[PDB]
């Protein structure tokens, strides 16, 4: 007998996409080969993002992509996102962008192309930059989800600002005892 613990032997991580999308599986095959047969760590990151779930591949708005592309030294670089690129109607000027995405919204696609931009899929990105040279790997806001407002410390604990689960919002719904000093306590 040996003195070890076996509760952490099996690392919990995606070794493949749980999706049955045959097109996603094809470009997983392409980037499984690229990650193995190159020393590019860019291919390793892209490959493991391809396995990720939809909640782990948040959409990237056009405004956020433009703002990251506008940073110094990123001219003539390809914006790579492993997910959906989304139109942001809050912006009025779209510059010229070279973009690779898993998926682009129709309105966002029209805006990028009309501004002289270029849109690539991940198969075309492999031919353009097999090692991912001259690319900016972007990601949508991972915690930009309603669930994360409810996560954290319990709402009925001091110094916790987490949203409780309520069927309705109003003066009659969970605004009394434990929420104000007049009604017992507040914390």
């Amino acid at each position: 007998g040996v003195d070890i613990r076996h509760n952490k032997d099996r690392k919990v991580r995606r070794k493949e996409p749980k999706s049955q999308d045959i097109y996603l599986r094809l470009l997983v095959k392409l980037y499984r080969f690229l990650a193995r047969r190159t020393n590019s760590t860019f291919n390793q990151v892209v490959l493991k993002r391809l396995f990720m779930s939809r909640t782990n591949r948040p959409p990237l708005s056009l405004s956020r992509m433009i703002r990251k592309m506008k940073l110094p030294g990123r001219e003539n670089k390809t914006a790579v996102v492993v997910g959906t690129i989304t139109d942001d109607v809050r912006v009025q000027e779209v510059p010229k962008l070279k973009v690779c995405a898993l998926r682009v919204t129709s309105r966002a696609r029209s805006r990028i192309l009309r501004a002289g931009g270029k849109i690539l899929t991940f198969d075309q990105l492999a031919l353009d930059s097999p090692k991912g040279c001259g690319t900016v790997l972007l990601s949508g806001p991972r915690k930009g989800r309603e669930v994360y407002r409810h996560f954290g410390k319990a709402p009925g604990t001091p110094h916790s600002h987490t949203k409780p689960y309520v069927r309705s919002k109003g003066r009659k719904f969970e605004r009394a005892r434990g929420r104000r000093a007049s009604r017992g306590y507040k914390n």
Partner: protein, 53 residues
């Protein structure tokens, strides 16, 4: 059902779904000189366990 450059004229809001992979020719992509130039040499020798003499 429309084209990718025309919306459908009999569905008033439908357009053809877009490909997430334009060229689904894995063999041709992998054999392209752009891919092959970036690769490291294949490691095809099999190293089996050595009997510790």
């Amino acid at each position: 059902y429309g084209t990718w450059r025309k919306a459908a004229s009999l569905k008033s809001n439908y357009n053809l779904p877009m490909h997430k992979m334009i060229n689904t020719d894995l063999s041709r992509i992998l054999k392209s000189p752009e891919i092959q130039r970036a690769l490291r040499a294949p490691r095809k020798k099999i190293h089996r366990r050595v009997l510790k003499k």
